[PDB]
Design a protein. Structure first.
Length: 331
């Protein structure tokens, strides 16, 4: 069995290996990369996502989100308070202001200590989930707006044609912006490219151990757990590495820098934080190996998780027994 300790693997494809996306994902899995839940892919030196980032300031962040925390430093939830619209140039200036800017630090480990000690005492503003792409149309390799669609994969594997579309999303971050513990919708893969700016630190639980994280979360968030049998679908709960180690939960961590891709694998729980002003692009995708995870994915039916149009068909075809209850949650 490849990668039996479920370590995060880092890949350096050549330009020839960067041509065929599906084939390279399958290669990484042949080496055991999925067992970690997360992998890093460093593009060949010949590749670029676009020519420059000098002309992005006029992108609009229609609904910036202020991430307000409640709890204790290592075990907290966050809610998202909507703010007035602002441009990417306005948000960059905000991120660099004395109130929001990254503090002085020694190295990534010192900044990680500072994050976990102090996050809850601040409310950083995140531009999340903005439909769009920063890949040039002429970039032919690993262009996250030109991937094979999940609807086409389901149709290729199972024969059923379904409605829905699959497009990328932009994230504009600042120091302390936070992504809560989650797996993807329908336990899909994700791919995330850090276009510019400061790093993103990730934490991940191996898929084979995901239920250990769920059981800890039910213990740590007992009201939320009574409210919903899949409350981590709400994407609001944070647990620190120190707390995870105290409770024996297997996990790993890694820092993504500008110019690097990360892939999350089906049922790989992940969480993390941004170091300073940055911009990332991410999309969900599927492979043949996903189908069995989609059929078994938990679902939120309490009403909180509310998701895209295109998840309807995935539930309807892969989980027909759960469909009626889940759809009530959506309405
Ligand atoms: O970068 C972020 O805020 C969160 N991204 C992801 O969870 C991802 O790419 O799967
Ligand atoms: Mg612009
Ligand atoms: Ni994710
Ligand atoms: Zn719920």
């Amino acid at each position: 069995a490849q990668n039996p300790n479920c370590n995060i693997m880092i890949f350096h494809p050549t330009k020839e290996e960067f041509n065929d996306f599906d084939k390279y994902i399958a290669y990484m899995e042949s080496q055991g990369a999925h067992r970690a839940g997360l992998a890093k892919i460093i593009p060949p030196k010949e590749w670029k996502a676009r020519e420059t980032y000098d002309n992005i300031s006029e992108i609009l962040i229609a609904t910036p989100l202020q991430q307000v925390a409640s709890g204790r430093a290592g075990v907290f939830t966050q809610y998202h308070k909507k703010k007035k619209a602002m441009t990417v140039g306005e948000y960059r200036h905000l991120a660099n202001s004395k109130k929001y800017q990254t503090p002085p630090h020694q190295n990534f480990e010192d900044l990680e200590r500072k994050y976990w000690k102090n996050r809850i005492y601040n409310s950083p503003i995140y531009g999340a989930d903005i439909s769009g792409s920063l890949f040039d149309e002429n970039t032919k390799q690993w262009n996250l707006g030109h991937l094979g669609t999940i609807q086409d994969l389901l149709e290729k594997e199972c024969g059923v044609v379904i409605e829905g579309v699959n497009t990328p999303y932009l994230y504009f971050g600042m120091w302390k912006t936070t992504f809560a513990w989650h797996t993807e919708d329908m336990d899909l893969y994700s791919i995330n490219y850090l276009h510019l700016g400061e790093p993103k630190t990730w934490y991940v639980v191996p898929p084979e151990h995901g239920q250990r994280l769920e059981r800890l979360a039910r213990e740590l968030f007992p009201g939320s757990s009574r409210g919903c049998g899949a409350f981590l679908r709400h994407k609001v709960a944070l647990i620190s590495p120190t707390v995870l180690k105290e409770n024996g939960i297997p996990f790993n961590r890694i820092t993504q820098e500008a110019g690097e891709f990360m892939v999350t694998f089906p049922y790989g729980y992940h969480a993390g934080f941004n170091h300073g002003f940055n911009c990332a692009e991410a999309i969900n995708f599927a492979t043949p190996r996903w189908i069995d995870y989609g059929k078994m994915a938990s679902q939120c039916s309490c009403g909180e998780a509310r998701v895209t149009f295109s998840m309807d068909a995935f539930v309807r075809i892969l989980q027909p027994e759960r469909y009626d209850l889940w759809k009530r949650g959506q309405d």
